[PDB]
Design a protein around this ligand. Structure first.
Ligand SMILES: CC(=O)N[C@@H]1[C@@H](O)[C@H](O[C@@H]2O[C@H](CO)[C@@H](O[C@@H]3O[C@H](CO)[C@@H](O[C@@H]4O[C@H](CO)[C@@H](O[C@@H]5O[C@H](CO)[C@@H](O[C@@H]6O[C@H](CO)[C@@H](O[C@@H]7O[C@H](CO)[C@@H](O)[C@H](O)[C@H]7NC(C)=O)[C@H](O)[C@H]6NC(C)=O)[C@H](O)[C@H]5NC(C)=O)[C@H](O)[C@H]4NC(C)=O)[C@H](O)[C@H]3NC(C)=O)[C@H](O)[C@H]2NC(C)=O)[C@@H](CO)O[C@H]1O
Length: 540
């Protein structure tokens, strides 16, 4: 007779292809990429003949087989593809094979293949749009927003984006390499811990706890291998297979390393580390470079060189070459983007007409034109146009686009920036004709998280009532609120100014819109980005 039916032994059923060491703070130790997951299964036979061959089946296919030599056994084998498998043990002899009931096993991988889709309800004022315009609709999500701001990946209105950018992935380096981090409490230290035993100029993760280990919706079980932002973004990729999720390298405080990359030894180490990072974290779809900025005038007053232009173009060509190689190794399309200053003085430090040939999209940072960093020369921080009172205003969106176009950049490469925050001042005074932007200020407005900056959610929720004036400047295409008694003045984008930008994009055949930062919106901004670019209301 055929063998008795085996009983699969109770035991761990969760395994990983990319292992995460749960007691490691250094990135080098934290993640271990294997070719295949080591799986184990054991069984007992409570009734009958044990057969002469035991096999482990996944979905009916043999993953292991050996002699059946007693009433219990164990099998250790490798599984090289992520997913959920119905595993059975079968005992066979010449008279037949008898299979156990199936037990699911979970084989983890960083494409999110082991994960349920994370497909969460729209919150706040967000309404559903179809991505059918062909235009970019992007936004940044910040790794540290999961603490105070309490804004997690399950809160992103992901159906309403084409591009989700993760700020920010750091470049390893201590003294003289990331000095701009020292201005943020404990930040520089944290990077040194992550980067322990790791070369400088290779990428790492800045907060491995937030990125990989914090409990979050859908990844809360102790043995879920990937938690935090990365585990949720993997599950988001399962829900939104066409969303481009890009790691963004740099930003205001993590850009110092780029200034060293005129040394091709360092640039090549960087590029190679980016390749390794995308082979490790397969849910990411390319890389965004946010170097602030070639030529200097970024956070560090001691960096910047006339060579930075050339280094930027070389870097993009070499990133593109590495992504094209990754793309054909994998069958995937990988994207290369960059967030750039919109100031013409910074634009013309780079030959974007040359670098565009390597880049899918240019994220024009058409915001921060004005703010509490300059208490004397006030103006709209994210306007499309100059205002009536100063038609020669240098920093406007249109001027940054036109600088790019005047170099020879193709319009379709250019994605226009919209602000999900305001900047502002207090104590504004000495202004004429009821236009507060003609005065000067005494300090920063009281921000939501930091001085001088206010989430749009808070502008809409608190500063559109009581004593606050609200004015839409139709020349500049820009809203502002002003509290006369405290001279508090805030310049921000609203649904109407966003709709202007979006019509301007369609009229000038630009690439789309993107925003900073997704946590600060209540829905009104991203709704308008979508509507204004022609995306159909509704759900695919
Ligand atoms: C025309 C012209 O040329 N004009 C120029 C202006 O351009 C120029 O001003 C600059 O303009 C550029 C653009 O041209 C801006 O850059 C781009 O866009 C954004 C701006 O529009 C930039 O955004 C900024 O991004 C930086 C990131 O580098 C943000 O810094 C982050 O700040 C927060 C505080 O708010 C820090 O938050 C803390 O994070 C830690 C994590 O380690 C958390 O710690 C956790 O705490 C919990 C307890 O609650 C604890 O339990 C956990 O254990 C603990 N975690 C750990 C790991 O231990 C804290 O909780 C957390 N606190 C908060 C509040 O959340 C965060 O760490 C810090 N990040 C880093 C990595 O440093 C900054 O806030 C962003 N600003 C805005 C606008 O929001 C972006 O960099 C860049 N990219 C893109 C695509 O946008 C520049 O911002 C701008 N600079 C200035 C100075 O404004 C001016 C020059 O002044 O000049 C004109 O001429």
């Amino acid at each position: 007779a055929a063998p008795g039916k085996p009983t699969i032994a109770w035991g761990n059923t969760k395994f990983a292809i990319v292992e995460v060491d749960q007691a490691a703070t250094a990135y080098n130790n934290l993640v271990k990429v294997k070719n295949a997951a080591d799986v184990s299964v054991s069984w007992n036979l409570w009734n009958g003949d044990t057969g002469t061959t035991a096999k482990v089946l996944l979905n009916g296919k043999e993953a292991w087989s050996g002699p059946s030599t007693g009433s219990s056994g164990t099998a250790n084998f490798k599984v090289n593809k992520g997913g959920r498998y119905q595993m059975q043990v079968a005992l066979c002899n010449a008279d037949g094979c008898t299979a156990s009931d199936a037990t699911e096993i979970v084989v983890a991988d960083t494409d999110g293949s082991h994960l349920a889709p994370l497909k969460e309800p729209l919150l706040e004022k967000n309404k559903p749009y179809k991505q059918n315009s062909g235009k970019v609709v992007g936004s940044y999500f910040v790794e540290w927003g999961v603490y105070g701001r309490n804004f997690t990946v399950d809160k992103i209105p992901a159906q309403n984006l084409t591009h989700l950018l993760y700020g920010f992935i750091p470049i390893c380096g201590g003294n003289g390499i990331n000095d701009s981090l020292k201005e943020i409490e404990g930040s520089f230290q944290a990077l040194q811990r992550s980067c322990q035993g790791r070369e400088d100029f290779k990428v790492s993760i800045h907060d491995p706890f937030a990125a990989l280990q914090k409990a979050q919706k859908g990844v809360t079980a102790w043995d879920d291998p990937y938690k935090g932002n990365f585990g949720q973004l993997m599950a988001l990729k399962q829900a939104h297979p066409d969303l481009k999720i890009l790691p963004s390298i740099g930003g205001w405080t993590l850009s110092d390393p780029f200034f060293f990359m005129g040394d091709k030894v360092k640039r090549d180490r960087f590029v190679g580390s980016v390749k390794e990072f995308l082979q490790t974290w397969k849910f990411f779809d390319g890389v965004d470079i946010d170097w602030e900025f070639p030529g200097g005038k970024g956070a560090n007053p001691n960096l910047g060189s006339p060579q930075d232009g050339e280094t930027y173009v070389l870097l993009m060509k070499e990133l593109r070459a590495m992504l094209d190689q990754l793309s054909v190794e994998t069958g995937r399309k990988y994207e290369l983007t960059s967030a750039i200053s919109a100031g013409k003085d910074k634009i013309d430090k780079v030959a974007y007409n040359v670098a565009q040939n390597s880049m899918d999209h240019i994220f024009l940072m058409s915001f921060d034109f004005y703010g509490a960093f300059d208490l004397k020369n006030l103006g709209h921080q994210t306007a499309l146009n100059a205002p009536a009172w100063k038609p020669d205003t240098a920093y406007t969106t249109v001027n940054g686009v036109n600088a790019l176009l005047a170099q020879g950049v193709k319009p379709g490469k250019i994605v226009v920036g919209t602000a999900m925050y305001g900047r502002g001042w207090t104590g504004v005074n000495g202004y004429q004709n009821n236009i507060p932007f003609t005065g000067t200020a005494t300090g920063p407005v009281k921000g939501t998280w930091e001085n001088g900056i206010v989430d749009y959610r808070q502008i809409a929720g608190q500063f559109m009532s009581g004593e606050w004036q609200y004015t839409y400047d139709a020349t500049a295409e820009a809203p502002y609120v002003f509290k006369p008694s405290t001279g508090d003045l805030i310049t921000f984008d609203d649904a109407r100014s966003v709709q202007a930008k979006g019509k301007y994009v369609l009229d000038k055949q630009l690439g789309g819109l993107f925003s900073w930062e997704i946590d600060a919106d209540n829905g009104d901004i991203l709704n308008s980005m979508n509507a204004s670019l022609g995306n159909s209301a509704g759900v695919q």
